[PDB]
Structure formats: C-alpha cells, structure tokens
C-alpha cells in the first residue's frame, strides 16, 4: 500500500508539473528578471542623457571635437551610470541566488543525503526522503513526506494506577476506547495491552492528576502459575 | 472607468467595477488592506475581505486524544533557484 | 518580518506638476521605471514575508470555550474578547511599545494588523490543543499536561518528572510568563529591533524629502523659480543639473531599500523557520529557540514584526 501510495504521488507530479504553466515561477521568474535587466541595459543605448544624439559616431562625424567632447562626457556619464545601476541590481540578485544556493545545499545536505526533523523545513508533514531533480538554472526536491489521515476520538490518561504504584508509558500513549485501556504509538493508533514491558513504574497514585484505576498484565505471572 | 459603475471605497483606494459581497473567499487577487477580487458567479467581478480559512475549533478536552489510524504517503515539490 | 510597504513615483518626485522637467526625464531613458519596477518589487516581497511568516497554518484553528488546561495560564497569550481588536495582553503592549505626499505613498499591507492577529490566534489555539500535530497533518486534540509532558520527552527528561510536577511546573510557567509581560512593560528598548526599522525607513523617507531641498549646484532648488528665472536655454541646463541630483538621490534611497529589504527578507525567513521548528514542533537545535532545551513557543504579532516567547 506504501509503495501503491509513493508511486501514484510521483505520478501525480509528473501530472501536476505537465498540467500547471506557473509550477516552476521561481526559476522563470529569475530567468526573466535577468532577461530584463540585460535588456534595460541594451537599450540604454537608445537614451540621449541630454547629449544631441544617442549615438556617438553621429556626434564625432557632426561637431567638431572640441565641442563634442562635453557631448561624449554626458553619454559616458549616462551609460556609465546604467551600468553601474545595472551591475549593483546584479549583485543584490546574485545575493538573493547565493542565500537560495545555500538553502538549496542545505536542503540537498540534510533532505537527500539524511532525514531531517526540522518541522516544514523539507514537505509539509513527517519527512521522510527527498529526490533532486535539476532544472534549468535551479534545483527540484521531491519531499517524500508522511502524513496521518484518519484519526478518531480517544480517551486518554497521563499514567495508569496498578498496586498503589503509577504506570507510565515507556515510549507510547495511554488511550482507551471506552472500556478497555491500551498503550499506543503517538503517530498511528496500534493498540498494545498494557504491560510491565511497555511500561516504567515510577511514583505513586496520588501525585499524579488524572491517573485512572486499571491493571498492567505481567508476562511473568503466566509462566509461575503453569 | 470613470465613476458611475460600482464604486466601492475600501481602505487601499477607490475601486471602481467589483461588486462589495458580505461573503468571505480565499485571497484571488490582492487588492490590499485585506480586500481581495476574484471572478464569481451572472458573472461579475467581485471584491471582498479575504478568508483566512475554515475556523474549526479542535475539541480539546483535558480527557481526550486523538490517534490517527491511516496515513498517506505525499510528495510534495519544491523549487529553489 | 516586513518593512514599511512605500512606493515612490520617481516622475513626480523628480519634477512635479511642471512638463518641461517631465520632457527632460523623459530623455534619461528607463531609469524611473526601473526605480518603480525595483520598489514594487520590495512591496510584495514584504507581503510575501509576512504571509510566509504568519500563514504557516491552514485552517484558523479557536481554543475551547472554558480554558482548562491542567494549571497552565494563557491569558496573557491568549486573545481577550472585551478589548475592541482581539489582541492578547502581551500583544497590546506589543502594539503600544512601538511608536509626506511629494510623490511619496505608503501603501496599506495586504494583511490587516486583524488577520495577523487571527492567524497568531490560530497558531496560539493549534499549539495550545493539537501540539505540534498541527503542523504536520491534521490538528490532532491532546490533553495540554500530556503535551508538554512529550515536549519533557523531547529534551531527554522522562515524563515521569512533569506528571509529579504539574502544579510547579504550572506556577513556574505562569510566573514566567506573567515576569515577561511586566518586563517588555519597563523596559524601553525591549522591542529594539523592531523601532529600530521602524526609525531608518523613516530616516530614509525623511532624507529623501530633504534632498528634495538641495541646490545639487544649480540656481536655486525650487523648480518654479528656475522655470522663471531664466529662459529655456539655460532653464534646460539647470533642470538637468536638478533632475541628476535628485535622481541620484532617489537611486541611493532605492538602492539602500533594496539592501534593507534583502535584510528584513533574511530576518523574515528565520521568523518562518522559528515560527516552522518551533511553534509547529520542537526544535534540538541549541539556542535555536530559546536558551535552554527547548519546550515550546508561542508567536505574537508585533507591529512589523513577530514576537516569540520560548519557553524553555
Ligand atoms: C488506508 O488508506 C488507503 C488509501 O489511502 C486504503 O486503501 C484503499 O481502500 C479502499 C477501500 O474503499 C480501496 O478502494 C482502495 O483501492 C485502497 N487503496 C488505495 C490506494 O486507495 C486503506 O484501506 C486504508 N486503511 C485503513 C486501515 O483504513
Ligand atoms: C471528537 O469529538 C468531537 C466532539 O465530541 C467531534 O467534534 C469530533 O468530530 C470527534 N472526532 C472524530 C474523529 O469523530
Ligand atoms: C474496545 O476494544 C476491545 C479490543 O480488545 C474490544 O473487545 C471492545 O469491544 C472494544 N469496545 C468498544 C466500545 O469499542
Ligand atoms: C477534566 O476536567 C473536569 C472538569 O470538571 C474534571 O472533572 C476532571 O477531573 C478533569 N480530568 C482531568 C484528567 O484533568
Ligand atoms: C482506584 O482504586 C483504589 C483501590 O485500589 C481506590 O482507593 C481509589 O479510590 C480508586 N480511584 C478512583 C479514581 O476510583
Ligand atoms: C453587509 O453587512 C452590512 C452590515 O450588517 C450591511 O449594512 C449591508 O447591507 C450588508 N450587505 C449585503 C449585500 O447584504
Ligand atoms: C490567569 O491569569 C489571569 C491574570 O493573569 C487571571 O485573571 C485568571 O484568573 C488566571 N486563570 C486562572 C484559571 O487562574
């Protein structure tokens, strides 16, 4: 049923991937933002600055040089400037790409080469793999996640009162279906007797706020009695 | 579009052409100050406070827990530049 | 988490209501337009930081009616229904500590100081019901002593301890929470950060309007006076003179914006990865959260900014 599961929720990528134009926006829009800013900067060209032509040949061949110096100090100074405007927007943008190059190493570090417990870091849910795939000036993760479905009601209490001693559960939780008392994973309802092994006594009944009255099944009595 | 048709004041500006609804929708477009269009149903524009999302209160008891029984197996994609 | 969301007209600022200094803009070629296109761009970045900060959960979770969990207080966390806008009494203080047209407008945030409330609530309800289940599938209910008693399993202390110690536990918890409200009530530079960004996009905005002002060489800063003055030969020159010192100007405010905003981006990503280890789980990472081993945390809004209270 796992397997069924991750090979219908890879399918469903391919699917979601193929169907979505916008499902890739942050590597189109950072192609698109570099796309723009070489394009501002070519046509800068066109821009007179205040000089009489946009080009300068224009501008040696008509006025004589004396003269058409201060012409070629305004173009320079305009050109000079965009690309300068241009070369600092580049390097705000090439932060922003090495902030998410590193997050991008980090998340390849800890999500492919290990599985991490920081929560949302890699998929929404438990994580549990993740998959690279590269992309055109980027990086794809396939966060393989584990997520509970169906939950139902239960009656719970923090420790279980046998013999005058309180029971705690080892490594689970104390839940009840109305009659009978379980000990039970936190993260999927499997219901185990409840059991000296499953259980480490420490304390007594009365400190505890919301202990209930049952009884832990010894493993050992059985064998003494046959 | 000039004044005339629709016109609603909200806190981002005047908004002219979008129908005020008392309803509340997921965020469609961000006009701003918390006031979102969208195209609704016969079909008009309209412009309403944004929904933040189903408010359902859990049924915390200091007696009861919740054990899920099933889980799913979901993949989720991620991009980064 | 977000910066003041501002927007400069850059043809307005450069030359107002007059043409001829529009005409002589017109001819630097799209420095205006890039300069808009780059603001704009800082505006929905900052709505996309707070919505990435704050918008972690996906249904706007509500505490039970009767607030019974186990001794522990959340009062002061928790919104109060009698004051007109439903913010906790950390967050009134919060909101109480921190304290121009020429082309300049300052657009409204996408979301309301209400909805980042609401959504504080909601993160406030999951945490304080469901754990950190809520993060990471659905809300899944659970007595307030047992959670934190998985939270003491987490730092390695058997639950043991905490079912034996639930009343000090809660004093201690209530205390503690009651000590940090009545320390951001004294101290003036408790929310330091936050009045700090505050006060340089301020200075900024101010420095910009005052270089307004400046000569940058020519006859006299007030353009009108320029315009009649002198004839349009030499009007031309003037007003290219003006036009370079105050483009100039607004490219700093820009590019100081544009560093100021990939900062206020780093800090509201780490506000997201707190709020994402933290407040939806617990988190191993040492002094991440918190100095001490880490036990819980409990966001709240905070005018351009969030709050956390680890609790630890
Ligand atoms: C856990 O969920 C899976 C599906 O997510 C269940 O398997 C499906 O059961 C239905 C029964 O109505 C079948 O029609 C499907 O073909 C099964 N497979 C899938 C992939 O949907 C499974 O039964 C659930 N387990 C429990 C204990 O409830
Ligand atoms: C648990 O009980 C509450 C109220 O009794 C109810 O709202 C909720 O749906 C129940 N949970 C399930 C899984 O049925
Ligand atoms: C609870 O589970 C036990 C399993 O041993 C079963 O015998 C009993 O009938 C169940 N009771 C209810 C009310 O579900
Ligand atoms: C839960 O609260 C009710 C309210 O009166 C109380 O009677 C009961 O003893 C409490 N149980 C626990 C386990 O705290
Ligand atoms: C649990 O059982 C003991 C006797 O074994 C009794 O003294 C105590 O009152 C019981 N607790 C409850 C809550 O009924
Ligand atoms: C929306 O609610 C307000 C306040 O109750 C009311 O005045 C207004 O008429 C309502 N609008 C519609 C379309 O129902
Ligand atoms: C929680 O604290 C507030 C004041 O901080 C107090 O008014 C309230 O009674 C307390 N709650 C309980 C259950 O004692």
Not at chain 2, 22 to 44: F, L, R
Not at chain 3, 74 to 94: A, G, H, N, T, V
Request: net charge neutral.
């Amino acid at each position: 049923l796992i397997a069924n599961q991750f090979n219908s929720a890879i399918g469903k990528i391919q699917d979601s991937l193929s169907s979505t134009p916008s499902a890739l926006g942050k590597l189109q829009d950072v192609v698109n933002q570099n796309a723009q800013a070489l394009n501002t900067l070519v046509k800068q060209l066109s821009s007179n600055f205040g000089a009489i032509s946009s080009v300068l040949n224009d501008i040696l061949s008509r006025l004589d040089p004396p003269e058409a110096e201060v012409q070629i100090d305004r173009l320079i100074t305009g050109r000079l400037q965009s690309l300068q405007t241009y070369v600092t927007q580049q390097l705000i943008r090439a932060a922003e790409i090495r902030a998410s190059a590193n997050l991008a190493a980090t998340k390849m570090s800890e999500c492919v080469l290990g599985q991490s417990k920081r929560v949302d870091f890699c998929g929404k849910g438990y994580h549990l793999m993740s998959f690279p795939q590269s992309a055109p000036h980027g990086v794809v993760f396939l966060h393989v996640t584990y997520v509970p479905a169906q939950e139902k009601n239960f009656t719970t209490a923090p420790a279980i009162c046998h013999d005058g001693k309180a029971h705690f559960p080892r490594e689970g939780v104390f839940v009840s279906n109305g009659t009978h008392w379980f000990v039970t994973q936190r993260n999927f309802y499997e219901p185990q007797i409840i059991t000296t092994d499953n259980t480490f006594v420490s304390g007594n009944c009365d400190v505890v706020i919301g202990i209930v009255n049952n009884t832990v099944y010894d493993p050992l009595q059985p064998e003494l009695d046959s | 579009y000039s004044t005339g048709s629709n016109v609603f004041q909200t806190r981002a500006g005047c908004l002219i052409g979008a129908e005020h609804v008392n309803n509340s929708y997921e965020c469609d477009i961000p006009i701003g100050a918390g006031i979102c269009a969208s195209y609704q149903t016969s079909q008009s524009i309209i412009a309403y406070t944004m929904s933040l999302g189903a408010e359902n209160s859990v049924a915390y008891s200091n007696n009861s827990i919740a054990i899920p029984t099933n889980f799913t197996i979901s993949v989720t994609t991620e991009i980064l530049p | 988490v977000s910066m003041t969301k501002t927007s400069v007209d850059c043809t307005m600022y450069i030359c107002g209501d007059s043409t001829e200094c529009s005409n002589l803009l017109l001819q630097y070629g799209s420095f205006c337009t890039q300069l808009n296109r780059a603001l704009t761009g800082i505006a929905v970045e900052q709505d996309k930081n707070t919505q990435e900060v704050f918008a972690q959960v996906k249904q706007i979770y509500k505490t039970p009616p009767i607030k019974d969990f186990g001794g522990f207080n959340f009062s002061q966390i928790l919104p109060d229904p009698s004051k007109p806008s439903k913010r906790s009494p950390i967050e009134d203080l919060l909101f109480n500590k921190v304290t121009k047209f020429n082309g300049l407008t300052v657009l409204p945030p996408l979301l309301t100081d209400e909805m980042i409330a609401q959504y504080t609530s909601a993160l406030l309800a999951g945490t304080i019901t469901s754990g950190w289940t809520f993060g990471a599938g659905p809300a899944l209910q659970i007595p307030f002593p047992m959670q934190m008693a998985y939270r003491f399993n987490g730092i390695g202390v058997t639950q043991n301890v905490l079912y034996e110690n639930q009343k000090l536990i809660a004093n201690q918890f209530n205390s503690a929470i009651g000590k940090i409200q009545d320390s951001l009530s004294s101290t003036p530079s408790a929310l330091g950060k936050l009045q700090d960004v505050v006060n340089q996009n301020a200075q900024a905005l101010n420095t910009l309007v005052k270089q307004l002002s400046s000569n940058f060489g020519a006859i006299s800063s007030v353009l009108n006076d320029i315009l009649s003055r002198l004839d349009p030969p030499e009007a031309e020159v003037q007003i290219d003179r003006l036009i370079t010192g105050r483009l100039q100007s607004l490219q700093t405010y820009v590019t100081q914006q544009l560093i100021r905003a990939a900062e206020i981006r780093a800090s509201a990503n780490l506000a997201a990865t707190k709020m994402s280890e933290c407040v939806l789980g617990q988190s191993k990472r040492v002094d991440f959260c918190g100095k001490g081993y880490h036990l819980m945390s409990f966001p709240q809004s905070a005018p351009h900014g969030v709050v956390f209270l680890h609790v630890t």
